[PDB]
PDB file of C-alpha atoms in Angstrom:
ATOM      1  CA  UNK C  16      12.885   5.207 -17.170  1.00 15.60           C
ATOM      2  CA  UNK C  17      11.680   5.439 -13.570  1.00 15.12           C
ATOM      3  CA  UNK C  18       7.969   6.438 -13.522  1.00 13.92           C
ATOM      4  CA  UNK C  19       8.608   9.573 -11.463  1.00 15.90           C
ATOM      5  CA  UNK C  20       6.031  12.341 -11.506  1.00 15.43           C
ATOM      6  CA  UNK C  21       8.437  14.494  -9.468  1.00 15.48           C
ATOM      7  CA  UNK C  22      11.811  13.846  -7.875  1.00 15.13           C
ATOM      8  CA  UNK C  23      10.296  12.157  -4.801  1.00 15.96           C
ATOM      9  CA  UNK C  24       7.148  10.514  -6.241  1.00 16.74           C
ATOM     10  CA  UNK C  25       6.839   7.247  -8.169  1.00 16.83           C
ATOM     11  CA  UNK C  26       3.491   6.236  -9.710  1.00 14.19           C
ATOM     12  CA  UNK C  27       3.269   3.033 -11.738  1.00 14.75           C
ATOM     13  CA  UNK C  28       0.335   1.050 -13.158  1.00 10.44           C
ATOM     14  CA  UNK C  29       1.060  -2.702 -12.781  1.00 11.60           C
ATOM     15  CA  UNK C  30      -0.236  -5.362 -15.153  1.00 13.35           C
ATOM     16  CA  UNK C  31      -3.019  -4.950 -17.631  1.00 12.09           C
ATOM     17  CA  UNK C  32      -6.177  -5.923 -15.815  1.00 12.53           C
ATOM     18  CA  UNK C  33      -9.118  -3.701 -16.655  1.00 13.89           C
ATOM     19  CA  UNK C  34     -11.129  -2.139 -13.888  1.00 15.18           C
ATOM     20  CA  UNK C  35     -14.426  -0.429 -14.519  1.00 12.80           C
ATOM     21  CA  UNK C  36     -14.847   2.916 -12.808  1.00 11.71           C
ATOM     22  CA  UNK C  37     -16.121   3.554  -9.269  1.00 11.48           C
ATOM     23  CA  UNK C  38     -14.727   0.370  -7.704  1.00 13.13           C
ATOM     24  CA  UNK C  39     -13.373   0.313  -4.170  1.00 12.73           C
ATOM     25  CA  UNK C  40      -9.701  -0.552  -3.801  1.00  9.79           C
ATOM     26  CA  UNK C  41      -7.611  -2.490  -1.365  1.00  8.72           C
ATOM     27  CA  UNK C  42      -4.755  -0.200  -0.365  1.00  8.87           C
ATOM     28  CA  UNK C  43      -1.691  -1.909   1.117  1.00  6.53           C
ATOM     29  CA  UNK C  44       1.440  -0.548   2.675  1.00  8.45           C
ATOM     30  CA  UNK C  45       4.511  -2.544   1.502  1.00  3.56           C
ATOM     31  CA  UNK C  46       7.282  -2.848   4.151  1.00  2.00           C
ATOM     32  CA  UNK C  47       5.769  -4.512   7.230  1.00  2.00           C
ATOM     33  CA  UNK C  48       2.582  -5.544   5.398  1.00  2.00           C
ATOM     34  CA  UNK C  49       3.398  -7.313   2.122  1.00  2.00           C
ATOM     35  CA  UNK C  50       7.053  -7.932   2.886  1.00  2.00           C
ATOM     36  CA  UNK C  51       8.938  -8.246   6.108  1.00  2.00           C
ATOM     37  CA  UNK C  52       9.975  -4.812   7.355  1.00  2.00           C
ATOM     38  CA  UNK C  53      13.615  -3.754   7.435  1.00  2.00           C
ATOM     39  CA  UNK C  54      15.527  -0.564   8.121  1.00  2.00           C
ATOM     40  CA  UNK C  55      17.022  -0.293   4.633  1.00  2.00           C
ATOM     41  CA  UNK C  56      14.877  -1.936   1.933  1.00  2.00           C
ATOM     42  CA  UNK C  57      17.531  -1.579  -0.815  1.00  2.00           C
ATOM     43  CA  UNK C  58      18.704  -5.197  -1.374  1.00  2.00           C
ATOM     44  CA  UNK C  59      16.324  -7.365  -3.369  1.00  2.00           C
ATOM     45  CA  UNK C  60      18.021 -10.503  -2.097  1.00  2.00           C
ATOM     46  CA  UNK C  61      16.836  -9.772   1.475  1.00  2.00           C
ATOM     47  CA  UNK C  62      13.132  -9.447   0.548  1.00  2.00           C
ATOM     48  CA  UNK C  63      10.798 -11.979   2.182  1.00  2.00           C
ATOM     49  CA  UNK C  64       7.015 -11.979   1.844  1.00  2.00           C
ATOM     50  CA  UNK C  65       4.700 -11.941   4.854  1.00  2.00           C
ATOM     51  CA  UNK C  66       2.603 -14.993   3.997  1.00  2.00           C
ATOM     52  CA  UNK C  67      -0.279 -13.842   6.169  1.00  2.00           C
ATOM     53  CA  UNK C  68      -0.973 -10.992   3.699  1.00  2.00           C
ATOM     54  CA  UNK C  69      -1.288 -13.358   0.743  1.00  2.00           C
ATOM     55  CA  UNK C  70      -4.909 -14.455   1.463  1.00  2.00           C
ATOM     56  CA  UNK C  71      -5.962 -10.786   1.378  1.00  2.00           C
ATOM     57  CA  UNK C  72      -4.307 -10.096  -1.951  1.00  2.00           C
ATOM     58  CA  UNK C  73      -5.726 -13.334  -3.410  1.00  2.00           C
ATOM     59  CA  UNK C  74      -9.215 -12.441  -2.164  1.00  2.00           C
ATOM     60  CA  UNK C  75      -9.093  -8.947  -3.675  1.00  2.00           C
ATOM     61  CA  UNK C  76      -7.701 -10.336  -6.934  1.00  2.00           C
ATOM     62  CA  UNK C  77     -10.536 -12.874  -7.231  1.00  2.00           C
ATOM     63  CA  UNK C  78     -13.131 -10.263  -6.249  1.00  2.00           C
ATOM     64  CA  UNK C  79     -11.946  -8.025  -9.133  1.00  2.00           C
ATOM     65  CA  UNK C  80     -10.922  -5.241  -6.689  1.00  2.00           C
ATOM     66  CA  UNK C  81      -7.768  -3.302  -7.597  1.00  2.00           C
ATOM     67  CA  UNK C  82      -4.857  -3.727  -5.176  1.00  2.00           C
ATOM     68  CA  UNK C  83      -2.897  -0.515  -4.722  1.00  2.00           C
ATOM     69  CA  UNK C  84       0.490  -0.403  -2.976  1.00  2.00           C
ATOM     70  CA  UNK C  85       1.099   2.942  -1.210  1.00  2.00           C
ATOM     71  CA  UNK C  86       4.562   3.127   0.371  1.00  2.00           C
ATOM     72  CA  UNK C  87       6.752   5.764   2.003  1.00  2.00           C
ATOM     73  CA  UNK C  88      10.402   5.250   1.014  1.00  2.00           C
ATOM     74  CA  UNK C  89      12.158   7.807   3.219  1.00  2.00           C
ATOM     75  CA  UNK C  90      15.481   6.020   2.808  1.00  2.00           C
ATOM     76  CA  UNK C  91      15.694   7.694  -0.607  1.00  2.00           C
ATOM     77  CA  UNK C  92      15.610  11.221   0.855  1.00  2.00           C
ATOM     78  CA  UNK C  93      18.052  10.076   3.537  1.00  2.00           C
ATOM     79  CA  UNK C  94      20.626   8.799   1.020  1.00  2.00           C
ATOM     80  CA  UNK C  95      20.384   5.197   2.112  1.00  2.00           C
ATOM     81  CA  UNK C  96      19.425   4.231  -1.463  1.00  2.00           C
ATOM     82  CA  UNK C  97      17.799   5.616  -4.626  1.00  2.00           C
ATOM     83  CA  UNK C  98      14.983   4.977  -7.048  1.00  2.00           C
ATOM     84  CA  UNK C  99      17.012   2.327  -8.886  1.00  2.00           C
ATOM     85  CA  UNK C 100      17.234   0.254  -5.730  1.00  2.00           C
ATOM     86  CA  UNK C 101      13.496   0.784  -5.150  1.00  2.00           C
ATOM     87  CA  UNK C 102      12.854  -0.483  -8.678  1.00  2.00           C
ATOM     88  CA  UNK C 103      14.885  -3.648  -8.059  1.00  2.00           C
ATOM     89  CA  UNK C 104      13.417  -4.330  -4.612  1.00  2.00           C
ATOM     90  CA  UNK C 105       9.843  -3.568  -5.611  1.00  2.00           C
ATOM     91  CA  UNK C 106      10.241  -5.725  -8.701  1.00  2.00           C
ATOM     92  CA  UNK C 107      11.426  -8.581  -6.506  1.00  2.00           C
ATOM     93  CA  UNK C 108       8.353  -8.190  -4.251  1.00  2.00           C
ATOM     94  CA  UNK C 109       6.065  -8.375  -7.314  1.00  2.00           C
ATOM     95  CA  UNK C 110       7.977 -11.446  -8.611  1.00  2.00           C
ATOM     96  CA  UNK C 111       7.573 -13.256  -5.315  1.00  2.00           C
ATOM     97  CA  UNK C 112       3.861 -12.410  -5.335  1.00  2.00           C
ATOM     98  CA  UNK C 113       3.602 -13.772  -8.898  1.00  2.00           C
ATOM     99  CA  UNK C 114       5.134 -17.037  -7.683  1.00  2.00           C
ATOM    100  CA  UNK C 115       2.303 -17.216  -5.108  1.00  2.00           C
ATOM    101  CA  UNK C 116      -0.249 -16.557  -7.839  1.00  2.00           C
ATOM    102  CA  UNK C 117      -1.239 -13.065  -6.675  1.00  2.00           C
ATOM    103  CA  UNK C 118      -0.745  -9.576  -8.043  1.00  2.00           C
ATOM    104  CA  UNK C 119      -1.153  -5.866  -7.524  1.00  2.00           C
ATOM    105  CA  UNK C 120      -2.515  -3.207  -9.907  1.00  2.00           C
ATOM    106  CA  UNK C 121      -0.721   0.025  -9.019  1.00  2.00           C
ATOM    107  CA  UNK C 122       2.321   1.134  -6.991  1.00  2.00           C
ATOM    108  CA  UNK C 123       2.765   4.633  -5.527  1.00  2.00           C
ATOM    109  CA  UNK C 124       5.817   5.597  -3.511  1.00  2.00           C
ATOM    110  CA  UNK C 125       6.943   8.794  -1.784  1.00  2.00           C
ATOM    111  CA  UNK C 126      10.618   9.514  -0.987  1.00  2.00           C
ATOM    112  CA  UNK C 127      10.276  12.879   0.750  1.00  2.00           C
ATOM    113  CA  UNK C 128      11.202  13.073   4.435  1.00  2.00           C
ATOM    114  CA  UNK C 129      12.031  15.797   6.998  1.00  2.00           C
ATOM    115  CA  UNK C 130      15.314  14.114   7.953  1.00  2.00           C
ATOM    116  CA  UNK C 131      16.517  13.889   4.412  1.00  2.00           C
ATOM    117  CA  UNK C 132      19.524  15.599   3.075  1.00  2.00           C
ATOM    118  CA  UNK C 133      19.233  17.727   0.039  1.00  2.00           C
ATOM    119  CA  UNK C 134      16.315  18.654  -2.162  1.00  2.00           C
ATOM    120  CA  UNK C 135      14.245  15.613  -1.136  1.00  2.00           C
ATOM    121  CA  UNK C 136      14.193  16.772   2.530  1.00  2.00           C
ATOM    122  CA  UNK C 137      10.616  18.098   2.185  1.00  2.00           C
ATOM    123  CA  UNK C 138       9.093  17.584   5.613  1.00  2.00           C
ATOM    124  CA  UNK C 139       5.335  17.391   5.102  1.00  2.00           C
ATOM    125  CA  UNK C 140       4.741  16.554   1.509  1.00  2.00           C
ATOM    126  CA  UNK C 141       1.081  15.850   0.524  1.00  2.00           C
ATOM    127  CA  UNK C 142       2.115  12.416  -0.867  1.00  2.00           C
ATOM    128  CA  UNK C 143       3.866  11.277   2.314  1.00  5.47           C
ATOM    129  CA  UNK C 144       1.601   9.265   4.670  1.00  7.30           C
ATOM    130  CA  UNK C 145      -0.076  10.235   6.990  1.00  7.14           C
ATOM    131  CA  UNK C 146      -1.035  12.778   4.318  1.00 10.16           C
ATOM    132  CA  UNK C 147      -3.561  11.043   1.977  1.00  8.72           C
ATOM    133  CA  UNK C 148      -2.076  12.143  -1.357  1.00  6.42           C
ATOM    134  CA  UNK C 149      -1.145   8.734  -2.712  1.00  5.58           C
ATOM    135  CA  UNK C 150      -4.641   7.389  -1.993  1.00  6.06           C
ATOM    136  CA  UNK C 151      -6.284  10.453  -3.547  1.00  3.85           C
ATOM    137  CA  UNK C 152      -4.026  10.177  -6.616  1.00  3.30           C
ATOM    138  CA  UNK C 153      -4.717   6.448  -7.053  1.00  4.58           C
ATOM    139  CA  UNK C 154      -8.379   7.394  -6.719  1.00  2.00           C
ATOM    140  CA  UNK C 155      -8.129   9.878  -9.590  1.00  2.00           C
ATOM    141  CA  UNK C 156      -6.198   7.503 -11.803  1.00  2.00           C
ATOM    142  CA  UNK C 157      -8.408   4.431 -11.314  1.00  2.00           C
ATOM    143  CA  UNK C 158     -11.672   6.319 -10.685  1.00  2.00           C
ATOM    144  CA  UNK C 159     -11.909   4.664  -7.255  1.00  2.00           C
ATOM    145  CA  UNK C 160     -14.717   4.795  -4.727  1.00  2.00           C
ATOM    146  CA  UNK C 161     -12.503   5.914  -1.838  1.00  2.00           C
ATOM    147  CA  UNK C 162     -15.316   5.970   0.694  1.00  2.00           C
ATOM    148  CA  UNK C 163     -15.788   2.196   0.280  1.00  2.00           C
ATOM    149  CA  UNK C 164     -12.035   1.375  -0.015  1.00  2.00           C
ATOM    150  CA  UNK C 165      -9.978  -0.383   2.626  1.00  2.00           C
ATOM    151  CA  UNK C 166      -6.394   0.097   3.776  1.00  3.16           C
ATOM    152  CA  UNK C 167      -4.034  -2.337   5.540  1.00  4.50           C
ATOM    153  CA  UNK C 168      -0.669  -1.404   7.058  1.00  4.37           C
ATOM    154  CA  UNK C 169       1.462  -1.782  10.183  1.00  5.52           C
ATOM    155  CA  UNK C 170       1.900   1.900  10.984  1.00  7.81           C
ATOM    156  CA  UNK C 171      -0.509   4.443  12.434  1.00 11.95           C
ATOM    157  CA  UNK C 172       0.309   6.680   9.451  1.00 13.82           C
ATOM    158  CA  UNK C 173      -1.468   4.194   7.193  1.00 19.35           C
ATOM    159  CA  UNK C 174      -4.642   4.465   9.285  1.00 22.31           C
ATOM    160  CA  UNK C 175      -4.375   8.245   9.408  1.00 23.02           C
ATOM    161  CA  UNK C 176      -3.885   8.408   5.632  1.00 25.37           C
ATOM    162  CA  UNK C 177      -6.921   6.200   5.089  1.00 25.48           C
ATOM    163  CA  UNK C 178      -9.123   8.317   7.396  1.00 25.46           C
ATOM    164  CA  UNK C 179      -7.933  11.532   5.754  1.00 25.93           C
ATOM    165  CA  UNK C 180      -8.656  10.110   2.270  1.00 27.74           C
ATOM    166  CA  UNK C 181     -12.286   9.437   3.245  1.00 28.66           C
ATOM    167  CA  UNK C 182     -12.140   5.692   3.920  1.00 26.92           C
ATOM    168  CA  UNK C 183     -14.251   4.260   6.772  1.00 25.46           C
ATOM    169  CA  UNK C 184     -12.087   1.307   7.814  1.00 26.58           C
ATOM    170  CA  UNK C 185      -8.529   0.116   7.919  1.00 27.04           C
ATOM    171  CA  UNK C 186      -6.722  -2.911   9.386  1.00 25.53           C
ATOM    172  CA  UNK C 187      -3.666  -2.360  11.504  1.00 23.86           C
ATOM    173  CA  UNK C 188      -1.170  -5.187  11.282  1.00 21.22           C
ATOM    174  CA  UNK C 189      -0.212  -6.256  14.818  1.00 21.76           C
ATOM    175  CA  UNK C 190      -2.257  -3.353  16.173  1.00 26.57           C
ATOM    176  CA  UNK C 191      -5.185  -2.603  18.477  1.00 27.14           C
ATOM    177  CA  UNK C 192      -8.754  -1.716  17.589  1.00 26.55           C
ATOM    178  CA  UNK C 193      -9.996   1.879  17.668  1.00 24.32           C
ATOM    179  CA  UNK C 194     -13.684   1.938  16.728  1.00 23.10           C
ATOM    180  CA  UNK C 195     -15.162   5.392  16.336  1.00 22.35           C
ATOM    181  CA  UNK C 196     -17.925   6.937  14.247  1.00 21.21           C
ATOM    182  CA  UNK C 197     -16.584   7.734  10.770  1.00 21.28           C
ATOM    183  CA  UNK C 198     -13.426   5.577  11.077  1.00 21.06           C
ATOM    184  CA  UNK C 199     -12.638   2.199  12.508  1.00 19.59           C
ATOM    185  CA  UNK C 200      -9.118   0.863  13.008  1.00 17.68           C
ATOM    186  CA  UNK C 201      -9.619  -2.897  12.936  1.00 19.30           C
ATOM    187  CA  UNK C 202      -7.013  -5.110  14.612  1.00 22.80           C
ATOM    188  CA  UNK C 203      -5.019  -7.546  12.415  1.00 21.91           C
ATOM    189  CA  UNK C 204      -3.150  -9.821  14.809  1.00 21.61           C
ATOM    190  CA  UNK C 205      -4.303 -13.392  14.184  1.00 19.30           C
ATOM    191  CA  UNK C 206      -6.202 -15.535  11.664  1.00 23.22           C
ATOM    192  CA  UNK C 207      -9.634 -14.621  13.068  1.00 25.24           C
ATOM    193  CA  UNK C 208      -8.885 -10.961  12.432  1.00 29.29           C
ATOM    194  CA  UNK C 209      -7.644 -11.784   8.915  1.00 28.72           C
ATOM    195  CA  UNK C 210     -11.085 -13.339   8.442  1.00 28.35           C
ATOM    196  CA  UNK C 211     -12.721 -10.028   9.306  1.00 28.16           C
ATOM    197  CA  UNK C 212     -10.609  -8.352   6.645  1.00 25.20           C
ATOM    198  CA  UNK C 213     -11.380 -11.038   4.035  1.00 23.34           C
ATOM    199  CA  UNK C 214     -15.112 -10.702   4.728  1.00 21.44           C
ATOM    200  CA  UNK C 215     -14.820  -6.944   4.210  1.00 19.44           C
ATOM    201  CA  UNK C 216     -13.017  -7.416   0.847  1.00 17.03           C
ATOM    202  CA  UNK C 217     -15.520 -10.069  -0.303  1.00 16.99           C
ATOM    203  CA  UNK C 218     -18.499  -7.755   0.296  1.00 16.66           C
ATOM    204  CA  UNK C 219     -16.931  -5.387  -2.238  1.00 18.57           C
ATOM    205  CA  UNK C 220     -16.711  -8.132  -4.931  1.00 21.86           C
ATOM    206  CA  UNK C 221     -18.269  -7.917  -8.426  1.00 21.54           C
ATOM    207  CA  UNK C 222     -21.571  -9.560  -9.325  1.00 19.25           C
ATOM    208  CA  UNK C 223     -20.977 -10.990 -12.821  1.00 17.94           C
ATOM    209  CA  UNK C 224     -24.772 -11.427 -13.267  1.00 19.20           C
TER     210      UNK C 224
END
């Protein structure tokens, strides 16, 4: 069965790694961040990883920091595809990551969108980024330290969701910096900027002494 908590919300624990409580997480958007973005992410055969995200996932994995995918899937509300297609596509993304030796620990997805047709056409649902619901829910489920967590995505809504969830930093794929008290949008445009992100993840790593 699809792990739906309601008709437009999917929440799924991935793998069986154990995380002690009060860890920070690495939150990642999916389309445009982990995989190449596309208008209609319904065909698993079309999925291609963004290799420049793989060092970040690997770093978090090795640091013992949970990696949490938080993705809006408005195409579901819009009738472009359904949860079965999401399951196939998302599974393919996780398989490709496995082949690169990296993994994630939880997937949350929100179908609701204002331009939908039918009962999923809920315009401002708490789980739909920029609303922080998926981050807050992952926080409850994994007992996360949200204030120390990081988020990476290619849309402003990812940065807004992070700020609203209580994070202090996020990295905007292909985006510009916006450094303010309380929240910094960090640019992620080249390998130097990836380094900044990796340093930030590494500082969160476990001391096994």
